[model samples]
Target: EPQGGLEELSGRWHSVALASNKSDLIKPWGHFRVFIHSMSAKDGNLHGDILIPQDGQCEKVSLTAFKTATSNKFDLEYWGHNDLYLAEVDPKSYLILYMINQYNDDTSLVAHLMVRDLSRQQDFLPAFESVCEDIGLHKDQIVVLSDDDRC
Candidate 1:
C-alpha cells in the first residue's frame, strides 16, 4: 500500500531549495528553479506540470507519477524517463520531495522542498532539513533559495 498519498498536494508549490549529490550536474548552474502546478492524484494516477527555469529559459515538463505494488515509492515519468520521488507531507501541509534521478549511469539524489505558499516560510525549514538528513544529503550541497527568488 502507498503509505503517503498525494492527496494533499493539489495546488501551487514554490521551490524552496534543490539539494543534490551530483555537483557537476546541479552545481555551477545559474537560474535554477522549479514550480509544480496543479498536481492531481486520482485512481492511482498522478499528473502535474513542472515548470522549470534554466539559464533564463523556461521549460515545462509534464509528469505522470505512480507507484506499483512492487515499488516502494512514486515514479514520476516524463519523456519516457522516470525519476523516483519519495514524498512526505508535514503537519503544516508542506510537501517534501526526495527525488532520485537515475537517468544516466550516475546514481544521484536530488531533493526539492516545496510548499503551498509562493513565499518561503520559516516554519518549513526544519522539515526540509529533516528530510535531507534522513536521505543522507549533505548540507554543503544544499542551496537554499529565498522566498522571493525566481528563475
Candidate 2:
C-alpha cells in the first residue's frame, strides 16, 4: 500500500554522501571529515560516490548499467537507505529523499537521491514518504534482506 503521492520517484537514481568513519579503537578506525561534492545522472548513466577524509581516500560506486522506472518510485533488492522495503523515490526538490519501509524489521531507511532534470522525462531530486509502516530505528533491528526479482 503506497501513499503520499510517492509513486514517481523510484528505482536506482543517484546519490552523494560524506560521512565519518566509525572505528573500534581510538587510533581512528574509520574515515573522518569527508564531503560529498555531488552525485547525479550523466550521459545515459548514473554516478555516485563519497569523498574520503583529507587522506585523499575516496570510493565511488556505480551501477553496471542504468534502468528507467515506470513510476517515480521503484523496488530494489535491499538498501540501508530505504529501511529495506521497496524504495519509494521523490526526485523533485533541492534534495530528493528515497524512502523504504522495511516491513520485516519495522524500520525505514532514507537516502538523499537526485537525478537529471528535464521536461521530457522524470527528474530525480524531490522529497517524499513511504506508506505508513512504522519501523523503529534501533540497534537490534533486522537488516534489510535482499530479493532477486529486480535487475
Candidate 3:
C-alpha cells in the first residue's frame, strides 16, 4: 500500500534536515532553507517546485514527479536529473529519502533526507534517523535545517 498515498503528499514540505554519503566528508549542496512545493497528483502526473535559497535569492526549479511501479516510491525529474524518492508519511510527519550524485561525477554519493514539518517533531526523528543509519550516515553528518524567512 502507498501509506499516505499521493493526495496526502500535496502541500508545502519544508526541509527539516539533510545528510550526505560522501566518503571525503564533503557537505551537501543547497543552503539552510529548502522547500518542496508538491501539487496534488492528477492523472498520474504530480508537478512541484523546489525552492532553494542561494546567495540571498531564492531559486525555484520546476519538478515533475510520478509514482513508480511500486506505489510507495516516486520518480522525481528536476533540472535534467532524475531521483528515485521514497516517501513515508503519517498524521504528524512526512519523510522523503533519495540520493544525488556529486557534481564532478559518480565519484561520490549524496543522499538526501527531507521532511515536511519545520517543528522537528520527536516522533519523526526516529524514522528519519533509521534511514540515515541504514545508509551509513552518522547523526552528526545530518545537518538540521532551520525554518526561517521562507520565500
Candidate 4:
C-alpha cells in the first residue's frame, strides 16, 4: 500500500518558511515533496520521489531507503528554531513531516507535522510515537542536542 493504502500523499505537502544565519545555504530556495509506494517480489520494484522544487529536480528512491534516511540523522528543521526530527504520519490520510531549527547547528529539535490540517499547531506525543514505532525506536532513543538555544 502506498502510504497506508492512500496513493497520493506526495503532492499534499508544503515547505515552512525560515530565515537563515548562513547566507550560502540561501534558505533552500526550493520545496521538497515526499511520498510512499509499494514493492513487489522479483518483478518490478516500487519507488517514490522526493521532489526538490529547485530546478524542478526529482530524486527517486526506495521507501525503505528513505525511511532509513529519515530515521537516522536526517537533518531537516522546522519553523526557525526546532530541528526537524520525525513526525507521526497517517498513511491513510496523506501526510508526513519532520521538524527542525533554522540555525542548523546544535539546535534542539522540536515537533512539527503535515496533517490533514496543515495549519494546526503540532501535537508532539502522537507524532513522535508514530515515527518511533515505524523506525523501531524507543522514545528515549532520540537525541536531544541542545536546550538553551533560542529562536
Candidate 2 on 1-151: residue-level lDDT in tens? Answer: 2333433333433233211112211022222222223444443233334433333355443331132344333433332222222244335533433344354565434433234332312332112221222332232221111112101
Each prediction's total of clashing residue pairs, residues at least 3 apart in sequence or on different chains, is 0, 20, 0, 11
Error of 3 at 53 (Å): 1.2
Ranking of all predicted structures according to TM-score, beginning with the best and ending with the worst: 1, 3, 2, 4
Ten-residue region with minimum lDDT total, candidate 4: 142-151
Q: Which clashing pairs does model 1 show?
A: none
* Better model by lDDT: candidate 1 vs candidate 4: 1
- Highest-scoring model, TM-score: 1
- Candidate 2 — worst ten consecutive residues by lDDT sum? 18-27
Candidates 3 and 4 compared: the better one by lDDT is 3
Where model 3 places Cα greater than 4 Å from the true spot, the runs are 1-4, 23-33, 100-117, 120-123, 148-151
Q: Return the number of clashes found in candidate 3.
A: 0
Ranking by lDDT: 1, 3, 4, 2
Q: Which candidate has the highest lDDT of all?
A: 1
lDDT of each: 0.64, 0.31, 0.56, 0.33
Q: Could you tell me how far off, in angstroms, the CA of residue 139 lies in candidate 1 after the best superposition?
A: 1.3
TM-score of model 2 vs. true structure = 0.30
- The list of candidate 2 runs beyond 4 A from truth reads 1-56, 64-70, 76-93, 101-106, 113-151
Cα error, candidate 2, residue 122 (Å): 25
